[PDB]
């Protein structure tokens, strides 16, 4: 995760610096997206912190339900309580699975918003660089740098 984070967080700042060098006007459009991102990180982080915690607090009665089943297997099978404990497992598994599903869908919500912001970054940088190269000459090589 540290290697992936270093590569991502340095390619992002390198790319923003490159687009700011070839098109300074992009900085004017860099401000609202950084606003919009912030609002998304305002709304997701409250929800996800719940949905992670609810995913953890539903994993504890599942795993412990295994731990008491293995050590008390003779007792459960002596009372003929196999079906009741399997039903308890079905309840615990359903709770943990739907907590994980809501965490997954919240993550997909956030990633859809961030990737659409990235597509907007591409569109804005392309518009600024193409308008420059048709108006104020960029030698047609810095445009490829900014788009790449």
């Amino acid at each position: 995760t540290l290697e992936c984070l270093s590569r991502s967080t340095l390619l992002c700042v390198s790319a923003l610096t490159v687009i700011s060098y070839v098109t300074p006007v992009f900085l004017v459009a860099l401000l609202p997206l950084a606003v919009v991102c912030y609002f998304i990180q305002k709304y997701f982080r409250v929800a996800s912190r719940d949905l992670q915690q609810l995913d953890d607090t539903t994993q504890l009665p599942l795993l412990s339900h295994f731990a008491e089943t293995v050590e008390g297997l003779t007792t459960i099978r002596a009372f003929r309580y196999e079906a009741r404990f399997q039903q308890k497992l079905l309840e615990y598994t359903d709770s943990n699975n739907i907590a994980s599903l809501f965490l997954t869908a919240a993550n997909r919500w956030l990633e859809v918003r961030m990737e659409y912001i990235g597509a907007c970054v591409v569109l804005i940088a392309a518009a600024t660089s193409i308008s420059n190269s048709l108006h104020r000459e960029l030698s047609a090589g810095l445009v490829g740098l900014g788009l790449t």
Binding site: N97, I98, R108, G118, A127
Partner: protein, 598 residues
């Protein structure tokens, strides 16, 4: 000033002495009529007009896909109309304003269809039917006139109005399929679909199987949850119940059907084939979404090629200039718009792929957990009483091994869709560069045996790491449970030293894994640099086929980066794969253990 047909030759375009139907720029005036009819018949119905039990009409997925394609083709028609009228001094409103009116009409039509589908009003769909019929007529006349003046396929507007009439006919066929299935017109009216049983009374709040494709891909239904988490903490009441397709019992019965189909036992290979038979259809769906995302990811470098090539640098017909497909593709801004749309579609598909894979893994986890518990209720205590297995290992079959198999099922569609992306990327590299790209691909290929050697060493190191970590966790558990006896006998340091010895073996295996991981990362980060260097030196010093140019160089740079991005995570991929193989093997060992005889 601001005339519908441009004031050329003293407004000669408005002269309709030659058969007004075959007079051009009047058929473009005829095209506005269905769109404004739909707007004026739809805006009061939508404006004048909660349903937790919503259903979906037949052809719902197809209608949303056809509407998206219709919006894309109308955007292309607006772009080519703006391109076409930019030469004449008078602005021709008939070239882009009917296409924009069509775009607004299609947006209003899909909003009307969504409100009808969430309100279950099929009898109003007749109105949409009339609009599509009118649109079809007003397109096909135009197409016929474009055939009668010999436009041909060399002009983009002819292909775009052919796509327009094809999509209008397809939407008309979807509408007549809807009236065939659900008879909302004067008929017997026999068919009632009814809401799905999970939505109507069970109390599920995970609406992802039940939302339309726009809210299925953008995850719009999550929005309210993201709002309500500000006002109230999310608990197990705000999260509903699992759907029937996502329930643990359903996936467990599906896995049991797969295992019974295999038997008509256990082992790792049979477990893998059972997981294939139970969940590979969803895995194929996620792989298809990832394949489409990979294909649309190449629209980036091609658009960079076209844009930078244009920045480095025709037929009059019926009194209005026409644009060829080559002129439309090579005029900078349009590519940017296309790139933006392609990027949006790609991201949506990619997120869909991820979601489907993760959903599949969660279902797999539930099934596996149920099967493990059903083995526990049929287990024998002699397995634990003779040291064949311990309760910590049985609990780690759920806490650790099922998680490893689940994360490998997360990572499966990327591995399935990687070779198609590699093949298309190498083909496009040859298309942009030439033989230099073949040399660079040969440089990439020449280190593949070294990559395979590093991957095998990583797999062996992670097998040793898992083997030592299980023993370390077993010794740590038996030390922690009997801590009072170890303190009373002053044997805490001895058992701590034994756990340190097992941890030292694990750290030796981890050091081997980290050394070969660093070798893999250096190889997969020096392969792109050496490949790019050898291509861009051989493209000028060795070969003289073409100039270097910024378009070719930066498009090939984007293609090289896109092709080498999956190679960055080789260590994590091989670690997850070998952890899955170990997990499936010990799951098969546990499921094929002794039982209690009846």
């Amino acid at each position: 000033p601001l005339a519908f047909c441009g004031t050329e030759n003293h407004s000669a375009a408005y002269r309709v002495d030659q058969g007004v139907l075959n007079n051009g720029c009047f058929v473009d005036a005829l095209n506005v009529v269905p769109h404004v009819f739909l707007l004026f018949i739809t805006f009061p119905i939508l404006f004048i007009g909660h349903h937790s039990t919503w259903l979906h009409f037949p052809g719902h997925n197809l209608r949303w896909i056809l509407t998206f394609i219709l919006l894309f083709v109308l955007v292309c028609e607006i772009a080519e109309g703006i391109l076409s009228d930019g030469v004449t001094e008078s602005r021709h409103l008939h070239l882009y304003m009917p296409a924009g009116m069509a775009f607004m009409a299609a947006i209003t039509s899909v909003v009307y269809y969504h409100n009808i589908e969430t309100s279950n009003f099929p009898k109003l769909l007749i109105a949409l039917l009339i609009y599509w019929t009118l649109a079809f007529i007003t397109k096909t006349i135009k197409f016929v006139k474009f055939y009668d003046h010999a436009i041909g396929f060399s002009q983009l507007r002819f292909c775009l109005t052919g796509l327009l009439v094809i999509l209008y006919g397809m939407l008309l066929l979807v509408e007549v399929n809807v009236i065939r299935v659900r008879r909302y017109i004067f008929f017997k009216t026999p068919r009632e679909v009814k809401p799905p049983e999970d939505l109507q009374d069970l109390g599920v709040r995970f609406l992802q199987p039940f939302v339309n494709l726009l809210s299925k891909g953008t995850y719009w239904w999550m929005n309210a949850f993201i709002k309500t988490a500000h006002k109230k903490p999310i608990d197990l009441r705000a999260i509903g119940k699992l759907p029937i397709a996502m329930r643990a019992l359903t996936n467990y019965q599906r896995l049991c059907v797969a295992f019974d189909a295999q038997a008509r036992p256990q082992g790792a290979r049979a477990i893998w084939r059972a997981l294939c038979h139970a969940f590979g259809r969803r895995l194929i769906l996620s792989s298809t979404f990832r394949i489409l995302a990979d294909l649309l990811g190449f629209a980036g470098p091609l658009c960079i090629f076209g844009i930078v090539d244009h920045l480095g640098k025709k037929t009059q017909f019926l009194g209005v200039y026409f644009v060829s497909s080559q002129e439309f593709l090579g005029n900078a801004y349009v590519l940017a718009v296309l790139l933006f749309l392609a990027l949006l579609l790609q991201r949506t598909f990619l997120q869909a792929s991820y979601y489907v894979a993760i959903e599949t893994g969660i279902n797999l986890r539930g099934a596996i957990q149920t099967k493990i518990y059903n083995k526990i209720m049929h287990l024998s205590t002699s397995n634990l009483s003779m040291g064949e297995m311990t309760a910590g290992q049985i609990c780690n079959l759920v806490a650790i091994d099922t998680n490893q198999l689940m994360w490998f099922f997360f990572l499966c569609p990327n591995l399935w869709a990687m070779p198609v992306q590699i093949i298309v990327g190498v083909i496009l590299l040859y298309y942009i560069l030439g033989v230099s790209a073949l040399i660079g691909a040969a440089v990439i290929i020449l280190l593949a045996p070294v990559q395979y050697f590093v991957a095998t060493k990583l797999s062996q190191a992670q097998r040793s790491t898992l083997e030592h970590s299980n023993e370390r966790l077993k010794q740590t558990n038996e030390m922690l449970r009997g801590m009072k006896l170890l303190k009373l006998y002053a044997w805490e340091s001895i058992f701590c030293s034994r756990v340190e010895v097992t941890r030292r073996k694990e750290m030796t295996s981890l050091r081997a894994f980290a050394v070969y991981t660093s070798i893999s990362i250096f190889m997969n980060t020096a392969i792109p640099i050496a490949a790019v260097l050898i291509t861009f030196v051989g493209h000028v010093s060795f070969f003289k086929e073409s100039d270097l140019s910024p378009s070719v160089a930066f498009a090939s740079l984007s293609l090289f980066h896109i092709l080498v991005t999956p190679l960055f995570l080789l260590s994590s991929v091989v670690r997850s794969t070998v952890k899955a193989l170990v997990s499936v093997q010990k799951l098969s060992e546990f499921l094929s253990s002794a039982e209690i005889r009846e």
